[PDB]
């Protein structure tokens, strides 16, 4: 018959031309596309339309899939649109129209007896993202980031000692043998990262067939020329990704001397702004590079008033700096930049650095990587208005460039994009639904590997699911074998190959890395820029083709004080 | 005491209460999560003193007011639902639009 | 109205009925206080108890299953026993009969 | 000696014509016997019967019991009696008289230095209760349900997804291996359910090759008699439960329609008085029929004095009804009747509906099966007085009718009486101890499969496990591998033959459901009447041949306010 | 070049010569020696000396340490030394210099790529705590314990049951198989007693060939001449331990009988002061034998003001004991004795006790076998003064003797000191590190085999890991696999030679038990006085060569209020 | 802080003391988890000021009277055992009879 598109949206959710803000941010995203066959749209309940006959087939469970995730709008690198997201096996199958062709028209998700449902209408669906700046400081970590909606955390680390407190390295065979059975009790995807600072290759070749899938070189061990080269060297033949926290105090050289080492080999550089770590005051001209793919971490994302009070103990207590010892502070002082802290949100919106990260608990904040990417897409609309590329009346592309960011980018750089990073077919189904009011706060569902891993869950012994007091609590995504059958542990190709899988006994879906050399600053999704930038000596002034690039602190921040009790 | 793990996770509720209690003395507007926690604690309070279910769908809309709290916040709370033992057992109260 | 109260009719329970008993005197010659317990065999008891172990022999305390005798230092006082039921096999306490008997 | 009652009941527990009140109720029961010998009770203790040589035996572990409860007042649907019960290999080896065969006479339960022991002078013991009506919504139910004395939990769901919320449906071999799966983690035995509703067999055929033990139709997969007969005539081939929740819509038929397709084979209906579901608003007649195995939910249970004002929002939130939607409401509306919910107290009473479940978090509370069934019975005598088949001044025979509806009946009706149910020789010892203060509200001890697995436990620093806070904690029978060993995954007799248990690895002991067709309403244990009983199609009035059945709501009950915080 | 003592203190922990206070009591240590090169200390952070080519080498794995704890001030029975700890395979691999061989002098522990580093200048470090006096009433006992300092538990039980709550039982075969697979969820070593209590030897055999490492003879299970005797035998068969708890009723014989039975041979005495059980009231004076390895419980150390109004109704709980029965009471109150609880203390001062153990929930505190033992050795410090050994102006001889009484000489007495018990080479790498301020009562960091299990850790989601709330938190050490790698469980050379673990399917190492009939008073760390000790059967006063040992109760005692919440 | 395991769950029992102690004050009879949390509690706070435990059994039992209970709840309460850290370390009070 004929509906109007007001109810129409209360149903099923907003269509083409439909408008949508993003919590309570300034951030609106247009609906550019929808897969339904107006009329013909599936919906679950008592009267519904899934029902035998209906809008669930006879097929059997081979021919149908396995969930179903009803009126979804996704939002992600390749487009903002309204779908039926079908998922077989723990992977995504088809983006849609889901339904019944015995009866309805243009069913390319078929719905069975064996097909469970989950309603998305209302609701924004995104791909589970990826944090590759992990500190595994201790294991409470990946709840915390789990509930925040990332799905994936790469880094390394043995617990709460010294090594890791500061540097995201797993040292050693044992170490990495034994973070990797640890790994399995995680409700994550993990792989991790060696301490790749050393001169003799064969110690780093032996972390790498022991199950590392990346090299870390961090100061704090030496970040030396002759380090980062022989890191390099090994990468290059292993086919893994090296993550670089260069040399802050130029001990060994200046940032044009670490980058003459890099000798143009592939490279992810870790807060690329140098507040977090790197050559003082210029490790941000690293970003200009074709090898170069660079993160930022998350405290100062964005520029807010209180940053800089914030970060002189932030930065004595993570590296092991004596306070009261004059050369530990001059050099801590050093780190922190107004400049660099203020172009760094700039450059993200220009699409200059094409990854942001946590830091977890050494200089950055596990459950906040979504929440801060955000803030500063805001802050960047609110100070710079539409972007070049923008089309219409929304922030459409602005939102394709800052999801990348935590998404496909950092899944490409650690060469695990074949598995994860965003919602395209074949690839593993860790999703996170969103009610729009809560988008990048606080998530709907969690689903990791085609399973509800965490999600609110009210009073457990009420009627219904929704009566106070509401708080995140583990699903069966997260319960034992379950749980291994929806995660993956990333290896590396010599690992995998030299069976430390069945030698440790690791139980959980494994996944391995590759294509960590090929990629360049060409390949980061929307986020590609290599400008011509520079960094004044003194005056700590960045400067690109000659402009200045800078911005002004914020004092207050959506996604803030109206969603959280402390 | 013997505790089950009900009564332990509405400790949680009426601490959290604890914290809008104060804030809301000292005069502040509200956010989201304080304001379903007081109102919440509220209606559990109303159970342990004997109030009906009907008495309480009623009360629980005049515990906070638009004015109370921070803007946006009545509109991310289209209901409010607690359940506790009333004199005849456990029962389930739902507040629509609480804040108005 | 008393949460889960009993309503025990009143009246008495005889105990170990049908079963031979035998009184006797003992007496504690020792300086610190000895227990008795209601199963054990009292032909075994602490040696500082002195009383005709011969007549107690296959036989414990015909006291409420559970329940104790107590004797201080020098303290004379005559019980009652109970003969053992079933096989009438004893093992154990001192390790004096360790078979039937 | 000679000893007096009063006193005698104060070491041992009550005799032969004690009564004890049931918590703070108004039923009483009354020992019925007494299988011990006057003067050669066990005890244990210092100075003691339970000791080397006395008490205790010299016997080798296989001719000992592992674990003896002594002194407990067993409550059952055979009898209310004191004994002790003896444990061997996780079932129940005897009930009888402990003691040592040396020594003592009539000992049947010889204790050794193999036994363990648990002092039940004082307590009342019953079997662990078993929830045909749960939804997975979370893991979180598994505790909260053995909290309160429910040791096995059959029903369906994959988590929190909008299928499972309203259905109890296990969605296809892919969720239904991953549930089995996840199965092994939590502390109680565990059977799934598959979505039943399909018009061809081979869809459902695989459902119950892939491990559920039994099929849930639900009108909101649609309820329809193609969809019934199809799963009824698979569950006749492969042994197993049918569950249904009909159409209350009357959209494809009436009541006798429903029952027309249902063609006389054995069936278990859910919410049989209609308020949770089924036909508008007569779908209560079915507990008339030999072949129908009728239950309720708990929420209608008993009737009070807010139970209509809660029941509208708690309807429309678990079926995913839009309040705004005119036919959502009205359908809300037709199914809570006063009436109805008011005759249902009375056909429990009589022993016309024989079953009591929870229908977690979807219209039901998970851990107030057992208390909701104990407020039912009190309320009864209050109104009815004594049933017919009472006899001396106790209400012994109300109680056996009672207990037996989420024990025995609930096991019958799933063809898991075999393995669990009640406290007979040969079962598995889920078992559950009562301090008679408590009874039916919180429980002293909670034993799985011989092993304690959770109990009230106090401050763990402290001298004795007394002191606050005492509070529900994990015990052993829950930990890893020993939770494993004590706890059950009931399997379909084609899924037990396929080696789905090898297949997906799963480490608990394996149990295989039958007799499931067989069953009829007269196998009921003391609730197996069928009354011609009729509905009013506007008055909504419940006659059994011809006089009116109805209640009063009670304004308040026991077993509430006095032991709950909140 | 030079730098004054108090700044070298400050950045690389005290050195020789320098004092240290223990936590807030009164006991000052010296550092007798210090195994470093001055000037060539590790150190890491940024810029220090552990990084590539300097304080780090370019050797292979299987050439470095994977762990090195830096700076450390080593307390253990043979010395309080400066030193570097080097951890290899999970276990202590060396004690000396750590370093690069090429461009440091003395290195003896070799650091590398492989090394990872826990910085423990300014910190104290000890071996992880045994307590053998373990009820296993409840799993949450262990990370009670864990959290406190004490890695290894050996006890018995199966849970919240009558038998267990009184005796360290783990009755039978079945629960002794249980909880040995229940074992591997623990994060501490365990090795389990079965019931000693029974006079045919073949009874016995069975629970050791099942996988008890020893057997507990409780009175409440008949502690007859007969059963020790047999338990004793089968002890000396079976190479295990006998621990006893003999017969406070006096029922069966005094302690001169008891002494008669176990006729010389090796036993462990429980409480051996009696207030938890033991001959009334001389059962004491078995401390005076070559045999006797005397240990005692802890609520009676030190002897405080509220000591004697707090043991009354302890003792009445635990040993199931009814007040209204006067025997009953007459019997828990000659246990209670102010001469026997005051002796006590100083016979530990003296050395004459050389054990100190929990007696979890059972009349003892699990969390508190540590802080007790260092609270006597204050109160013996300030009532008594300094110990004969005593040397220079320090207690370090007091502190040796009082370290060994809950690690080394509970590890010779159960024949497990070959795998625990102290920080020497081969040994498992059983730590805890301790900052000063809190040494004995919270610890910076348990160390499980060589990973960390628990410690304290600030907000998840903080910027660093300091942030509070600060509270102990499980760590990867304590998850799934890595636990099991980590932790062992102690099995008898029969059940290891059985394939007991194998049958199982025990998943943690396993270690073996040997020489526990060997040992003897004279084999006892820094504690093996066997004095002309005498009780006064009416007075109980104590007295050792006539002359009459006593102390007085404190008021106020250190390790309290300043540091507990509550 | 580092707050152990024994800490935390301590806090447990204060929280459930605040819930009792308001009803209390609105003039409610308490019922059985509230009247174990609230004479605990005190128990506590006694021995953190530094009074006996020799003076606590006794204290203990003024702290509630039948008169203030739910009916049953002094039966339901034979003794209540709470451990605080004493001036001179951790010690048990046991107060029997708490409730007349």
Chains 1, 4, 5 share one sequence.
Not at chain 1, 127 to 146: K, M, N, R, S, V
Request: with cysteine; charged share 20%; net charge negative.
């Amino acid at each position: 018959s004929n509906i109007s598109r007001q109810a129409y949206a209360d149903m099923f959710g907003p269509t083409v031309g439909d408008k949508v803000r993003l919590a309570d941010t300034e951030l609106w995203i247009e609906v550019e596309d929808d897969l339904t066959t107006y009329g013909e749209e599936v919906k679950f309940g008592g009267g519904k339309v899934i029902r035998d006959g209906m809008g669930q087939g006879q097929m059997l469970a081979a021919d149908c899939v396995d969930l179903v995730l009803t009126n979804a709008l996704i939002v992600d690198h390749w487009g903002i649109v309204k779908a039926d997201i079908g998922v077989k096996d723990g992977r995504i199958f088809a983006i849609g129209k889901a339904g019944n062709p015995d009866i309805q028209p243009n069913v390319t998700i078929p719905i069975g007896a064996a097909t469970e449902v989950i309603a998305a209408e209302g609701k924004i669906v995104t791909a589970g993202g990826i944090d590759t700046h992990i500190h595994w400081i201790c294991p409470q970590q990946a709840e915390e980031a789990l509930v925040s909606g990332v799905t994936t955390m790469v880094g390394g680390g043995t617990g709460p000692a010294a090594g890791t407190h500061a540097t995201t390295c797993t040292p050693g065979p044992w170490y990495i043998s034994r973070m990797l059975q640890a790994a399995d009790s995680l409700p994550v995807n993990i792989g991790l990262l060696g301490k790749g600072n050393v001169s003799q290759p064969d110690a780093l070749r032996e972390q790498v067939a022991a199950g590392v899938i990346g090299l870390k070189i961090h100061e704090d061990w030496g970040a030396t020329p002759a380090a980062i080269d022989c890191a390099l060297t090994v990468a290059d033949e292993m086919d893994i990704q090296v993550a670089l926290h260069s040399d802050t105090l130029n001990e060994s050289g200046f940032v044009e001397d670490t980058l003459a080492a890099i000798g143009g080999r592939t490279i992810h550089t870790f807060h690329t702004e140098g507040a977090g770590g790197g050559h003082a005051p210029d490790i941000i001209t690293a970003c200009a590079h074709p090898n170069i793919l660079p993160s930022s971490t998350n405290p100062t994302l964005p520029y807010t008033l209180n940053t800089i009070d914030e970060h002189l103990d932030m930065l004595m207590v993570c590296h092991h700096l004596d306070p009261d010892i004059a050369e530990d502070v001059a050099f801590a002082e050093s780190r922190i930049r107004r400049e660099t802290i203020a172009a760094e949100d700039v450059l993200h919106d220009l699409g200059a650095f094409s990854l942001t990260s946590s830091d977890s608990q050494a200089m950055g904040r596990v459950g906040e990587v979504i929440l801060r990417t955000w803030q500063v897409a805001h802050r960047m609309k609110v100070q710079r208005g539409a972007l070049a590329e923008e089309t219409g009346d929304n922030d459409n592309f602005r939102v394709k460039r800052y999801i990348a960011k935590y998404t496909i980018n950092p899944a490409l750089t650690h060469g695990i994009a074949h598995e994860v990073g965003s919602i395209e077919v074949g690839k593993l189904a860790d999703l996170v639904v969103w009610s729009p009011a809560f988008f990048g706060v606080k998530p709907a569902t969690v689903i990791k590997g085609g399973m509800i891993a965490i999600a609110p869950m009210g009073d457990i012994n009420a009627s219904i699911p929704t009566p106070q007091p509401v708080h995140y609590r583990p699903m069966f995504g997260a319960l034992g074998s379950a749980r291994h059958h929806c995660r993956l542990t990333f290896l590396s190709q010599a690992a995998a190959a030299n069976g430390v899988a069945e030698r440790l006994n690791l139980r959980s879906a494994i996944a391995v890395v590759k294509g960590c050399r090929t990629v360049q600053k060409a390949d980061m999704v929307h986020n590609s820029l290599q400008p011509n930038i520079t960094v004044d000596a003194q005056t700590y002034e960045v400067r690109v083709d000659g402009e200045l690039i800078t911005s002004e602190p914020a004092d207050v921040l959506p996604m803030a004080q109206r969603y959280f009790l402390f | 005491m013997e505790l089950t793990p009900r009564e332990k996770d509405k400790l949680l509720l009426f601490t959290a209460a604890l914290v809008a209690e104060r804030r809301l003395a000292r005069g502040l507007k509200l956010n989201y999560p304080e304001s379903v926690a007081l109102i919440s604690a509220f209606i559990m309070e109303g159970a342990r003193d004997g109030k009906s279910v009907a008495s309480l769908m009623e009360e629980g809309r005049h515990v906070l007011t638009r004015e109370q709290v921070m803007e946006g916040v009545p509109e991310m709370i289209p209901d409010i639902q607690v359940e506790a033992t009333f004199p005849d057992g456990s029962k389930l109260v739902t507040v629509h639009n609480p804040i108005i | 109205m008393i949460p889960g109260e009993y309503h025990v009719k009143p009246g008495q329970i005889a105990l170990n009925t049908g079963r031979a008993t035998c009184r006797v005197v003992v007496e504690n010659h020792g300086d610190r206080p000895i227990q008795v317990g209601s199963h054990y065999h009292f032909a075994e008891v602490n040696p500082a108890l002195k009383f005709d172990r011969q007549q107690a022999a296959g036989y414990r305390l015909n006291i409420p299953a559970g329940t104790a005798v107590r004797f201080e230092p020098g303290q004379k006082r005559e019980v009652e026993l109970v003969a053992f039921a079933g096989h009438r096999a004893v093992f154990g306490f001192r390790g004096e009969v360790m078979g039937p008997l």
